[PDB]
Design a protein around this ligand. Structure first.
Ligand SMILES: Nc1nc2c(ncn2[C@@H]2O[C@H](COP(=O)(O)O)[C@@H](O)[C@H]2O)c(=O)[nH]1
Ligand SMILES: [Mg+2]
Ligand SMILES: [Mg+2]
Ligand SMILES: [Mg+2]
Ligand SMILES: [Mg+2]
Ligand SMILES: [Mg+2]
Ligand SMILES: [Mg+2]
Ligand SMILES: [Mg+2]
Ligand SMILES: [Mg+2]
Ligand SMILES: [Mg+2]
Ligand SMILES: [Mg+2]
Ligand SMILES: [Mg+2]
Ligand SMILES: [Mg+2]
Ligand SMILES: [Mg+2]
Ligand SMILES: [Mg+2]
Ligand SMILES: [Mg+2]
Ligand SMILES: [Mg+2]
Ligand SMILES: [Mg+2]
Ligand SMILES: [Mg+2]
Ligand SMILES: [Mg+2]
Ligand SMILES: [Mg+2]
Ligand SMILES: [Mg+2]
Ligand SMILES: [Mg+2]
Ligand SMILES: [Mg+2]
Ligand SMILES: [Mg+2]
Ligand SMILES: [Mg+2]
Ligand SMILES: [Mg+2]
Ligand SMILES: [Mg+2]
Ligand SMILES: [Mg+2]
Ligand SMILES: [Mg+2]
Ligand SMILES: [Mg+2]
Ligand SMILES: [Mg+2]
Ligand SMILES: [Mg+2]
Ligand SMILES: [Mg+2]
Ligand SMILES: [Mg+2]
Lengths: 95, 52, 110, 100, 19, 354
RNA sequence: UCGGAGUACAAAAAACCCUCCGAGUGAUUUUAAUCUAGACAAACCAGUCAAAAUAACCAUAACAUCACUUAUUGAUCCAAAAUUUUGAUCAACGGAACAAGUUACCCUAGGGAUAACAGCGCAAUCCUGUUCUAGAGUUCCUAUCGACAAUAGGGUUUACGACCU
RNA sequence: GCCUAACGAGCCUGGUGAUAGCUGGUUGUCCGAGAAAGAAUUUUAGUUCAACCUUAAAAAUACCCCAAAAACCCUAAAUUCCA
């Protein structure tokens, strides 16, 4: 990560994150499973399903990704037609 | 002996494919499989040879 | 060298829930390499031979008589060679179901 | 061949009195790797009855068994599990008969 | 289980000799 | 560390020494039998039966019965031996056997059954359906006198009430024909109770039809305490059970206490405890016959509540408990996306300040 | 790298240039679907089970089977395919897209975390004694010796260990 | 070998505050708690995850735990689990 850029002196984002993850606004990150397109003939249908999932990352990973990612990506987004707008608030969480 | 990975196609006119390990010295493979689009048990005949 | 590759991690085969515990439907009660515990009442058997609860309730272990399925050649042979008084026993896991199946409520008074 | 203390190595019978057999057997016994003795039926039962009689005669209240089993002074920390059976009579491969 | 009174209840192989 | 078995270990009996000289069951079936007999004994280790509710297990039965019919053992035995000699003698019968053509005159078997072991079967069916559990609470009686109840569905139609059978409330709109066999020095009391379907009181029941001081087999001649009220389960709840009880009484009994008004369409007025009612008259009345049926809501019942009881009609559902979800975690790890929906309140977007 | 047994005696886990067997797949037809409560396992990545509900089929018809069945396997990117997939003795098997020797001509940074000298530990090897006598000594065990073995010491040798430098 | 007293490739200046997972060093006082290693890794002189731990904050049960309970040949000290 570049903490202070050369031209702007701001903090850069690591684009390699932005291609494989998704940040809901609650702070949860969402990712594909690994190896889900790989060698499908060789796998059980059950395993294949487990692979086709979208899954959530643990706290540590989340904080790591947040550090690797600038402020812009944490903003509240309203997209038209967006699949994921349903999931961006958190509900009934007693902690 | 070696086996082979063949791409098998539906005769239901629905493009659907599934790959199978098949004996190299055996005949062209044909099976009764499940096609998800038509939601039926249909005949699949091997279209292509994928991996050797 | 002569000896090679003895190195593999444990499989954590064990018994996950113990007698008297509460369980929710779908909990794995045990996992095993060979049949050690057999599934009893309200306990489903997986294809890897692990036992899971089919009902919410309380786990109980029990010794009980073993009468194999006649489609199984091996077991019926083992049973068939026994002296005339003897009975195979095995260890089973059950879940004594907790909640009642359902209730009757008053929807509307017409 | 493994040999645990208290095992008969060689058994001689005959119309002999014990004394001749004892005389030349003690040589053999002496050239064995462990300490050993030449014994008759009479000798053996003699030393066993003596072994138990010594242990019901004992004047001091404190015996290895009594202390070890009840874990007095937390002594089980310094003892091995096997000790519970051996009762301080056996230590390693050694065996002291005088130990009650 | 070795500690229990019910140990070896399932014990059979001594009844049938197949070797 | 070994423990010591408490009492006998199961196979400890047979000799392992010399296995060849021991007889085996080479049949799967013999084994199955022996095993099922072993599964019925009272073992000293935790067992299936113990946890899964043998329902009080051993129970000393308070018996309020009619005394068992006294018949000579040896005489009966001789007579049956002879009858079977006769029946086995004929060549016609044997022909009917080898050629697989024979029939049993079911009416006559139903007759003999009703006469002989019927009472016991009816008893255990009643125990099964827990008649005794909701009526006398501890008590088992054997139905010595057979009770024949029927309903008129039309001119030619007759719907019988056997023990446990299903009947529709349409059929039961009218009082039934009741038949049993007694000469007359006799006095009886007949009772129809709805074992469940009381609305307010879980432990109590409804008397539908109660009749008393019944000479012999004469049904209508008895003074009716409670006028016939047709079966009325509620739409939601399934299968209420109605019970016909028959009591042999000695002295004429009069009760102004239990007597009900002639129309009697009030529910508070028919509320009943068979136990209590029996406790009262216990000295004279001994329960003799029994017949009962299963009944579920059908169309005609709607007319009852509105027309007779002057009520709205209560309707019920069958409600299953809401599914169990673990505590929601701040960072659900390696969990599918649809996770967030399990804790969802209702499906609707909500824009808080927006 | 993966698995089975012992080590690791009874929940789990558990090391070694530890002891032993294996795997890098065949054969077969029963061609083994979609979706989802709850769990196991777990640093992460990966792995495992699985009810209900759908759809397929007898017209209330979902565990592929066998070889100890357990293991028969490989991430991203990137390439080929066009609809949906396939691709590594990437075997150094959590995988650098592609790189070998040699230095006594050597250099720097360090290390007694690690060798060569010496010390120290230990005593396999080595050396001393005693114990035991079958035997050699023509006869005779112990004048002189003494096999098979026994008990104890010494701390020269070669090692072994890597504790000071 | 020799190329201005150091040539396996001169010297000087600049690149330059080269870069060192390696060594050394790191400056007032007093008080509160307080740590020995499972996993990967051209990795075992290092990192990054766990488990511990520290500072705040919300809670509710936490250890200790008697019966009962956990395998098939033999098998100990004992574990697991719980009022
Ligand atoms: N087999 C294989 N090679 C790959 C993959 N990704 C990148 N490559 C690399 O791509 C290059 C292809 O050129 P090649 O040497 O095969 O002609 C190789 O250096 C190979 O290592 C992959 O997924 N599989
Ligand atoms: Mg192992
Ligand atoms: Mg390991
Ligand atoms: Mg000696
Ligand atoms: Mg008789
Ligand atoms: Mg766990
Ligand atoms: Mg299903
Ligand atoms: Mg590597
Ligand atoms: Mg590696
Ligand atoms: Mg790994
Ligand atoms: Mg790289
Ligand atoms: Mg030279
Ligand atoms: Mg040279
Ligand atoms: Mg240097
Ligand atoms: Mg050193
Ligand atoms: Mg070190
Ligand atoms: Mg030197
Ligand atoms: Mg040297
Ligand atoms: Mg020196
Ligand atoms: Mg040295
Ligand atoms: Mg020195
Ligand atoms: Mg020494
Ligand atoms: Mg001589
Ligand atoms: Mg020296
Ligand atoms: Mg040494
Ligand atoms: Mg060391
Ligand atoms: Mg110069
Ligand atoms: Mg520096
Ligand atoms: Mg390093
Ligand atoms: Mg230093
Ligand atoms: Mg410390
Ligand atoms: Mg690498
Ligand atoms: Mg950490
Ligand atoms: Mg206990
Ligand atoms: Mg507790």
């Amino acid at each position: 990560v570049t903490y202070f850029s050369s031209r702007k002196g701001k903090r850069k984002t690591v684009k390699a994150v932005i291609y494989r993850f998704l940040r809901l606004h609650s702070g949860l990150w969402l990712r594909r499973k690994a190896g889900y397109k790989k060698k499908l003939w060789k796998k059980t249908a059950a395993r294949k399903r487990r692979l086709r999932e979208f899954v959530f990352c643990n706290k540590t990973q989340s904080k790591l990704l947040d550090k690797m990612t600038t402020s812009f990506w944490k903003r509240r987004n309203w997209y038209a037609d967006d699949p994921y707008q349903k999931y961006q608030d958190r509900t009934n969480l007693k902690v | 002996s070696k086996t082979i990975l063949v791409k098998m196609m539906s005769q239901a006119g629905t493009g659907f494919s599934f790959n199978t390990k098949r004996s190299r010295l055996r005949e062209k493979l044909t099976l009764l499989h499940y096609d998800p689009v038509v939601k039926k048990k249909v005949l699949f005949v091997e279209q292509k040879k994928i991996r050797s | 060298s002569k000896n090679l590759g003895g190195k593999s991690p444990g499989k954590r085969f064990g018994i996950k829930k113990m007698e008297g515990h509460y369980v929710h439907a779908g909990n794995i009660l045990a996992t095993q390499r060979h049949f050690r515990w057999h599934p009893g009442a309200h306990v489903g058997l997986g294809k890897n031979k692990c036992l899971y609860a089919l009902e919410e309730g309380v786990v109980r272990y029990t010794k009980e008589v073993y009468v194999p399925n006649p489609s199984n050649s091996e077991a019926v042979d083992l049973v068939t060679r026994l002296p005339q008084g003897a009975v195979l026993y095995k260890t089973f896991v059950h879940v004594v179901p907790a909640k009642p199946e359902g209730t009757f409520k008053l929807v509307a008074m017409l | 061949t493994p040999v645990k203390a208290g095992r008969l190595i060689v058994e001689m019978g005959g119309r002999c009195e014990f004394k001749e057999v004892q005389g030349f057997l003690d040589l053999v016994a002496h050239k064995l790797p462990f300490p050993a003795k030449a014994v008759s039926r009479e000798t053996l039962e003699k030393m066993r009855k003596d072994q138990e009689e010594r242990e019901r005669n004992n004047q001091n209240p404190w015996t290895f068994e009594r202390i070890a089993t009840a874990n007095m002074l937390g002594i089980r920390k310094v003892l091995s599990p096997y000790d519970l059976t051996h009762k301080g009579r056996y230590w390693g491969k050694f065996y002291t008969p005088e130990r009650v | 289980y070795r500690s229990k009174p019910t140990h070896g209840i399932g014990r059979y192989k001594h009844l049938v000799k197949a070797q | 560390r070994r423990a010591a078995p408490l009492g006998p270990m199961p196979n400890e009996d047979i000799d392992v020494s010399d296995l060849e000289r021991l007889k085996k069951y080479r049949s799967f079936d013999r084994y199955r039998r022996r095993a099922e007999q072993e599964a019925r004994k009272p073992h000293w280790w935790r067992t299936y039966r113990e946890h899964f509710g043998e329902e009080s297990g051993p129970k000393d039965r308070v018996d309020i019965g009619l005394p068992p019919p006294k018949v000579s053992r040896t005489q009966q035995l001789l007579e049956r031996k002879q009858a079977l000699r006769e029946l086995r003698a004929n060549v016609e019968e044997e022909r009917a056997a080898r050629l697989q053509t024979a029939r049993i005159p079911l009416e006559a078997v139903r007759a003999e059954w009703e006469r002989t072991c019927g009472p016991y079967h009816k008893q255990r069916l009643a125990e099964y359906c827990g008649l005794y559990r909701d009526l006398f609470h501890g008590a088992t009686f054997v139905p010595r006198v057979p009770l024949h109840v029927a309903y008129a569905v039309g001119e030619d139609d007759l719907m019988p009430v056997y023990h446990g059978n299903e009947v529709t409330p349409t059929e039961a709109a009218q009082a039934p024909e009741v038949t049993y066999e007694a000469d007359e020095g006799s006095l009886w009391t007949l009772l129809l109770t709805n074992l469940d379907g009381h609305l307010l009181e879980p432990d109590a029941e409804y008397v539908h039809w109660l009749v008393t001081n019944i000479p012999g087999n004469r049904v209508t001649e008895g003074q009716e305490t409670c006028p016939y009220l047709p079966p009325f389960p509620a739409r939601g709840s399934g299968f209420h059970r109605f019970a016909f009880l028959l009591f042999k009484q000695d002295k004429r009994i009069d009760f102004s206490g239990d007597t009900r008004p002639s129309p009697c369409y009030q529910l508070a007025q028919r509320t009943f405890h068979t136990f209590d009612f029996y406790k009262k008259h216990q000295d004279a009345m001994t329960p003799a016959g029994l017949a009962f049926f299963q009944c579920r809501w059908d169309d005609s019942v709607t007319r009852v509540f509105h027309q007779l009881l002057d009520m709205r009609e209560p309707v019920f559902e069958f409600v299953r408990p809401p599914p169990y979800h673990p505590k929601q975690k701040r960072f659900p790890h390696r969990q599918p996306l649809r996770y967030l929906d399990r804790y969802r309140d209702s499906h609707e977007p909500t824009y808080g300040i927006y």
